[model samples]
Target: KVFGRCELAAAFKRHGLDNYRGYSLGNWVCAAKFESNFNTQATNRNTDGSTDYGIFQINSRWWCNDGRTPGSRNLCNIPCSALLSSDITASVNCAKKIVSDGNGMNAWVAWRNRCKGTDVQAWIRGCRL
Candidate 1:
């Protein structure tokens, strides 16, 4: 599921996220870079015993159910496994809903801690979209 970062950006933009929330496309691309390196099937076991899923590394605690974990806010109402598919339609839709929440990309810890306030132009370099 892992692929080029620029490619991911293009898909996100094609999904209509390019102008959503007024956030730079780099914010989304760089976030995926740090979160899952563009792997749709990516999963990470967290220190708090929660798990992050997909390229966006959406959290299980509040976003999706992991079956092993209980009490997910499930704001996206998507199965965590659905996020792992190569088709990012559900994932992208979920993410667009997230970014539109007004805080923008700040919801992602990777964006807040690593992708925030940085020069991310290189993220879209050579990318047509």
Candidate 2:
């Protein structure tokens, strides 16, 4: 099932991502909108033929290994399906790693192309999160 904004906000809060890694909630929330439309099971194919997995669209080439994406580093050491699950633990953990790597939200093209420097307050709206 697709996630509501508040559900994602609650997940972000549960993971202490309200202002994670120097990024505002709106920044991350905005990224989620363009990246996966808040779907935990969301998968999108990249131009390089690799799949981006989960809420953050964590890349198979860089993060998880589905055993199908060749040259995958599986840096997060989690299964692609793990990120795709509704629980979101694996995805949130891996996302923290990705941010800690110093790239922050730059890892997601959606963030760069859309969320960056934009007024992202609308992403959360009346969610009170």
Candidate 3:
């Protein structure tokens, strides 16, 4: 999948980690793997089928918008359509906020095993990102 570099950069900046390139990319990608299998359009549904979710499996009715508008309170409601449009950083940062509660990437790692390997920046920029 092709992620938006500019959006990713914005997300890093929002999280106060403008330099988030190496270890940070690994952390985000790890979360992406666990949460949505790297599928930006992935979504989960409730048994009732009344709720509609979007990428990252976030339920718009509960978490936040699907990234349509800026600064959405419910993370799920923040539509990914806009997020996918070169605003990947904001999207990732938004997820980071919910997963970490603004505490940093530590919380994201809590959902899965600690990120392994090194040189994440090169990997992301050269391949994934």
Best by lDDT: 2
Residue 115 displacement (Å), model 2: 0.6
**Worst 10-residue lDDT window, candidate 1:** 64-73
Rank all candidate structures by their TM-score, best first, as comma-separated numbers: 2, 1, 3
Q: How far out, in Å, is residue 118 in model 3?
A: 12
Q: lDDT (0-100) at residue 50 of candidate 1?
A: 81
Error of 3 at 128 (Å): 10
Summarize candidate 3's per-residue lDDT along 63-107 as a digit string, tens digits: 556434334457434544444433354465555455555444444
lDDT of 2 by residue, 102-128 (tens): 777888888999999899877777886
Please state the error at residue 9 of candidate 3 in Å. Answer: 9.8
Residue 72 of model 1, lDDT score: 73
Best by TM-score: 2
- Tens-place lDDT digits, model 1, residues 1-129: 787877888898888776577877887888889988888999998887788889898888878877866677788897789999999888888888788777878899988999889987778888887
Cα lDDT, model 2, residue 75: 96
Give me the runs in candidate 2 sitting further than 4 Å from their true place.
none
Candidate 3: RMSD to truth: 6.7
Better of 1 and 3 by lDDT: 1
TM-score, per-candidate, Cα-based: 0.91, 0.92, 0.44
